[PDB]
RNA sequence: GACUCUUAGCGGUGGAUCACUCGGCUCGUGCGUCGAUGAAGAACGCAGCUAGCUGCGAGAAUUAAUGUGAAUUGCAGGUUGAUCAUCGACACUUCGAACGCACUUGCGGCCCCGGGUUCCUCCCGGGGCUACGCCUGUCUGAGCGUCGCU
RNA sequence: GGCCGCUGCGGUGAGCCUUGAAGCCUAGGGCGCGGGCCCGGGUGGAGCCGCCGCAGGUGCAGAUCUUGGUGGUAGUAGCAAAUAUUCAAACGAGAACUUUGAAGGCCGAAGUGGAGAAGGGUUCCAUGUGAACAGCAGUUGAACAUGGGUCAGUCGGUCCUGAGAGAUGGGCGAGCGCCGUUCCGAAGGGACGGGCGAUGGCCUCCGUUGCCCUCAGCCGAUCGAAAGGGAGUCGGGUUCAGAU
RNA sequence: CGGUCCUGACGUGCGAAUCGGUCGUCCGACCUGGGUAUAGGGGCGAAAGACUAAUCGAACCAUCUAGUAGCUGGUUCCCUC
RNA sequence: UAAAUACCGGCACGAGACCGAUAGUCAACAAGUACCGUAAGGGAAAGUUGAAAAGAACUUUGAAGAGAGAGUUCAAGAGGG
RNA sequence: CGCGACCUCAGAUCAGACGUGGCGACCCGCUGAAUUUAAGCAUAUUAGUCAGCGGAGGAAAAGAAACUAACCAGGAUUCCCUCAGUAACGGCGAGUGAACAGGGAAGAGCCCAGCGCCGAAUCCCCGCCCCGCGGCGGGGCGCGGGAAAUGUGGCGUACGGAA
């Protein structure tokens, strides 16, 4: 909604700041087992509970 | 599994003192020492003393 | 006495469990004056207490308690010992004369399932199956 | 009417965010949290659960003061004094 | 025969060790041996690698009699790479082949006083237990 | 040059204070730089501005509470800053002098009554 | 400007007359999306923000 | 000749077996330490390029000091001590027993400073206080409670 | 009775092994009544086995058994609720579906229109891509990747109380705590004004003041509505996405 | 607002109760949003054992619990007597 | 009012006729994580290139995925699950 | 009427302190079932057990006989072996169930109130001076302030004690 309150806005924000895929220049790391970022969220599909 | 399963036993000191007598009197033949498997080929007695 | 807080009287359960009038409670009411006086003054320490009046309804008790805290107690090197921390609530853990009387602890013939710690530590004395390493 | 159609009209919510916990069980009609319980003083823990027992505990978070407590404690608690200067 | 009740013969416990020792671990695990006439002169049979020391290369591919100056000592990957031990890439570029310390031995120290310091020590102590053994 | 710490303890406050102040100043105008976009020595840069605007903090704490003190040293109350911070427990236990101050009935006993030295033959 | 979500319009006016030795008409404020808090600030018809941006070091 | 079945070779799908193991499980040993000087727990932020994990707290992938002594590394960047480890000095955002009142982050009171005033009041910013119970002492009180003097 | 089979331990085989161990496949040669075993060929790349004893989480075809994978069905059932598409051009490697123009239609102002509340949380805007997704396709997208975007004294929260919730006093309770909302409270820290004592401002007159004199009821702290009560902004312009 | 009949459509559906035509009421014992109160042997019920988050002739969650079963199903190599 | 006594939490340790990735803790890996439920709570799957990235320059068909050659390697019959 | 004591009771953002909450493997105090067994079931059993509540420590609790015994007597507490599946309890069914003595690990005892006698001989706090100072203590000085006779300190406690 619209009307929001503060706590819920910065909460947002957090979770909107972390919905972020990774560089790939983490990717030439020595001891690296990541490929891709596996807690990715669409708006659509999950629905972030609250 | 159950850490109160009997792991150890009980043996009479009687019958543990009679086979290590029976080891000690096994232990003086070359013929059980060799087929024990050791080179005692060159030993000059079995039962090897040396001095002190 | 003590009545069963059980709604509408329906325990249930077994007939041998379906009282809730003539309950009594463990501690006494002694004891349990000292509770909660030592309770609502939390940074005090009970010694004892005595009795000073009953009628139908009530009963009166004066409760002893010490401040652990004043140096006039600090200093005083027979009665510091109430300023360590193993004799902290006394009373919530029945240390005191009251709490010991309703433990059914002492010496002799008539107390032997206390023999140990407590009734508790006698039980756990009692129930509990020595597996030696040899047996 | 019973399932889906009924499924239509939730619309709002009976928990938020607590302040104690951080978890959506504060009822906002009660006023009460239904994993801590805020309000109280006392945090709301049982002994039928092991596994809520364990999940938030002295082991799960920063440990951000008993952490060095531990490591302060190794040594005796020392204070007010510095390693020989060179 | 290890006889100490506070350190282990865990293989896993040494591999976790080894594989997460800190930097200044590393420093004292990169180790290698001197060469005979450093030996000789120094009394120290062995001492941990430094970035500019003249070193060769005892086996492997490019084992050979040449005398190679370090380029780099890279912790991480417990390599050292050397200024003519290089392999060519596919496209043209020439990279470093990493060599594990313990297989190189070094043939001219890079010498400033902590270095002098250490050498002094490790004689001292090895002349204190030779006055012990004999 | 390299701003270190050595070089700041005989300061005063008030160099340290404009020190401080030309490091913010820098450090504002690093950020703006890489904000609009700029150069990788800059970028670069800013961390080392950062670590020198906390070691002159740290160095002013450190001078001002070593003074505050030296202030408080002689008095009975001082701020609980101040006081010594060990564990809760630690802080309520007996102090020494009065964990070992004894009752002169059994000193006495002890004076009269010393536990001997003694040995029995064989 | 972008500034910290702690700030307001008084502080934000002062601070940017410290700063920037400039005089400051109003100034609106917002939360974005992300977080910061970004500031539009308006200055006093005789002072020139081509020219503020221009020593500032934006352009 | 198509189609179907069996067999073998090869090639697919699939991840069985074998070998590995910075993980567990069990036993034993020493120590056996939280919090109003603000704990456990939560939230939010911090890296030149950084999402998670990790570390940290507006001094924010750390400062100071001690020891070691030439690196970090995925890419850039510029020995009078880089990096690591130790850690005794300093510092430590908002909630949380959580403490001005409420829990929107809303509304206050008292005191002292710098802007305003040139204290005359406003207004702005900053700092220090402002919870419950309780012990000792202090001050101010109350009572046709017991008295004494007038 | 097993010189049948599996895993680990104590002894033994001067046992085997990068000139190739375990494991796997085999229209190869055999042995044993059988459990099974030994050789040959290929693959594989680091460990394995015989005999004497010891120990056990020790042998599967079934349990509408558990987990994982794969078949026939089968290129089958199906992609059929709400009237409908067509011509030409452009970009593009590629057009039934994208876009533009033209034609024919539908919703028909209780709309398939223009705006909000709850709820969602970046889905909004531009560019780029066409691996995956949009049950055909896509040059398209609410997809993916880069970047942007929400501006208030006069819109609302903020304030009030409503139905109601809830502390202190009090009562009850082994206890965490509960009842209770004016009920068993010494529940006011305010002030018209006068005096007393100190202070600053040209100590004028006033202000900030501590005390005395005098005056004084709250229906009970506190919470409770973005649709109730509640002073105060309208017109024109402006972006790609914001406008009282 | 509701849900008679076709016992129509569908019945591995559009849908774990929907669709069409036909139907009942439509100024009141009327329809409805938000706030608020009542909690499990309890609530609430113009009363059908109805409803109480797809669950109701006693909800849901964890534990006691690996509850008991004179009852169904399964129970792993060979040969010899 | 010490000692002899108890200890599946915590800080360090040492060991094992234990399990060896459907096992052993649910968790050998960004595991109380992803995800599900309004909430109390429920809760996974997922290890292995090579000694060293030397991780396939360059030529060519195709819009491209994707191929045919060339090259590294002892081995691509190890080509980024 | 006024003033001054004492007694009971109030308000302080008065000076200085203390408690709250967490973990909870072990410990102390309350509360306390039902599956299950009895081949049914109600006493009994499960079981003073799980769940629930409160309170600590590095250990806790207990502890120096209002004891055991009936002997030629032992001698605080706690733990191990045995006593012993015994005496006893039990729809005397299912089932349950100690202690004394003996051998060991450890080993340590003490203090008040009261009766009495000592010119309250006792304690806390504020100020100065000197030293010490990261456990706020020692000493000197105050015609300094309080607590206390409605009883502080010394001797003294059942093993007797005082003069
Ligand atoms: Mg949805
Ligand atoms: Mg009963
Ligand atoms: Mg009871
Ligand atoms: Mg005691
Ligand atoms: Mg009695
Ligand atoms: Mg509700
Ligand atoms: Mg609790
Ligand atoms: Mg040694
Ligand atoms: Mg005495
Ligand atoms: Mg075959
Ligand atoms: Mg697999
Ligand atoms: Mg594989
Ligand atoms: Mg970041
Ligand atoms: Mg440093
Ligand atoms: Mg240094
Ligand atoms: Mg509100
Ligand atoms: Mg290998
Ligand atoms: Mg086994
Ligand atoms: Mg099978
Ligand atoms: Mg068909
Ligand atoms: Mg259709
Ligand atoms: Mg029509
Ligand atoms: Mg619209
Ligand atoms: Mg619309
Ligand atoms: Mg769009
Ligand atoms: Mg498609
Ligand atoms: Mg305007
Ligand atoms: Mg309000
Ligand atoms: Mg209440
Ligand atoms: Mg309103
Ligand atoms: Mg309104
Ligand atoms: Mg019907
Ligand atoms: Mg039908
Ligand atoms: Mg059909
Ligand atoms: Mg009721
Ligand atoms: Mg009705
Ligand atoms: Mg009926
Ligand atoms: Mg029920
Ligand atoms: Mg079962
Ligand atoms: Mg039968
Ligand atoms: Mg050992
Ligand atoms: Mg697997
Ligand atoms: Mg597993
Ligand atoms: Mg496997
Ligand atoms: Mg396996
Ligand atoms: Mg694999
Ligand atoms: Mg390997
Ligand atoms: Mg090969
Ligand atoms: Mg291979
Ligand atoms: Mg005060
Ligand atoms: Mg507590
Ligand atoms: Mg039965
Ligand atoms: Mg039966
Ligand atoms: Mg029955
Ligand atoms: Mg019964
Ligand atoms: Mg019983
Ligand atoms: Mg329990
Ligand atoms: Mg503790
Ligand atoms: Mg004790
Ligand atoms: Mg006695
Ligand atoms: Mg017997
Ligand atoms: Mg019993
Ligand atoms: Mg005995
Ligand atoms: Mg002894
Ligand atoms: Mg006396
Ligand atoms: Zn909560």
Not at chain 5, 22 to 45: A, D, F, G, T
Not at chain 5, 91 to 109: D, E, Y
Not at chain 7, 2 to 30: C, E, G, P, R, S
């Amino acid at each position: 909604s619209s009307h929001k309150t503060f706590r819920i806005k910065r909460f947002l924000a957090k979770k909107q700041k972390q919905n972020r895929p990774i560089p790939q220049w983490i990717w030439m790391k020595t001891g690296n087992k990541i490929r891709y970022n596996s807690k990715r969220r669409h708006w659509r599909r999950t629905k972030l509970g609250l | 599994t159950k850490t109160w399963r009997r792991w150890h036993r009980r043996v009479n000191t009687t019958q543990k003192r009679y086979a290590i007598c029976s080891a000690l009197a096994a232990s003086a033949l070359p013929a059980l020492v060799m087929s024990k498997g050791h080179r005692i080929e060159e030993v000059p007695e079995l039962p090897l003393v040396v001095e002190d | 006495g003590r009545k069963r807080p059980v709604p509408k009287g329906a325990t249930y359960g077994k007939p041998v469990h379906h009282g809730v009038n003539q309950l009594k409670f463990a501690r006494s009411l002694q004891s349990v004056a000292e509770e909660r006086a030592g309770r609502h003054c939390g940074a005090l320490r009970v010694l004892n207490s005595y009795w000073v009046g009953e009628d139908s309804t009530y009963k009166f008790f004066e409760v002893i308690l010490i401040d652990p805290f004043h140096k006039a107690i600090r200093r005083n090197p027979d009665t510091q010992w109430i300023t360590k921390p193993v004799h902290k609530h006394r009373e919530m853990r029945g240390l005191t004369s009251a709490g010991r009387k309703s433990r059914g602890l002492g010496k002799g013939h008539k107390f032997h399932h206390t023999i140990g710690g407590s009734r508790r530590a006698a039980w756990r004395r009692r129930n509990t199956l020595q597996l030696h390493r040899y047996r | 009417t019973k399932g889906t159609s009924s499924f239509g009209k939730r619309r709002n919510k009976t928990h938020t965010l607590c302040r104690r916990c951080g978890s959506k069980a504060y009822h906002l009609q009660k006023s009460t949290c239904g994993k801590c319980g805020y309000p109280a003083k006392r945090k709301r823990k049982y002994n039928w659960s092991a596994k809520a027992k364990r999940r938030n505990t002295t082991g799960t978070g920063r440990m951000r003061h008993l952490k060095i407590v531990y490591r302060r404690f190794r040594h005796g608690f020392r204070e007010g004094t510095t390693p020989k200067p060179k | 025969m290890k006889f100490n009740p506070f350190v282990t013969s865990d293989r896993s416990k040494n591999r976790k060790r080894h594989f997460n020792a800190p930097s200044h671990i590393r420093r004292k695990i990169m180790s290698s041996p001197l060469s005979k006439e450093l030996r000789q002169k120094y009394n120290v049979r062995s001492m941990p690698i430094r970035k500019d020391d003249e070193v060769q290369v005892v086996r492997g591919h490019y084992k050979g009699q040449q005398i190679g100056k370090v380029v780099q000592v890279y912790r991480k990957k417990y390599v050292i790479y050397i200024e003519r031990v290089q392999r060519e890439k596919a496209n043209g570029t020439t990279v470093h082949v990493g060599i594990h310390p313990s297989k190189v031995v070094i043939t001219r120290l890079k010498l400033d006083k902590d270095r002098k310091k250490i050498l002094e020590r490790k004689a001292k102590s090895r002349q204190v237990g030779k006055e012990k053994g004999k | 040059a390299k701003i270190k710490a050595r070089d700041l303890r005989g300061k005063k406050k008030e160099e340290l204070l404009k020190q401080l102040d030309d490091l913010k100043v820098e450090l504002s105008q690093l950020r703006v730089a890489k904000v609009t976009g700029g150069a990788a020595s800059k970028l670069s840069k800013i961390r080392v501005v950062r670590k020198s605007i906390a070691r002159v903090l740290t160095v002013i704490n450190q001078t001002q509470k070593e003074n505050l003190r030296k202030f408080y040293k002689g008095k009975k109350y001082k701020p609980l800053d101040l006081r010594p911070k060990k564990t809760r427990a630690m802080r309520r236990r007996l102090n020494k002098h009065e964990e070992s101050l004894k009752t002169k009935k059994q000193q006495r006993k002890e004076r009269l009554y010393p536990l001997r030295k003694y040995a029995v033959k064989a | 400007f972008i500034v910290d979500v702690k700030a307001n319009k008084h502080q934000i006016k002062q601070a940017v007359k410290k700063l920037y030795d400039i005089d400051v008409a109003k100034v609106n404020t917002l939360i974005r999306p992300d977080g910061e808090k970004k500031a539009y600030v308006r200055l006093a018809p005789d002072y020139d923000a081509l020219d503020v941006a221009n020593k500032i070091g934006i352009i």
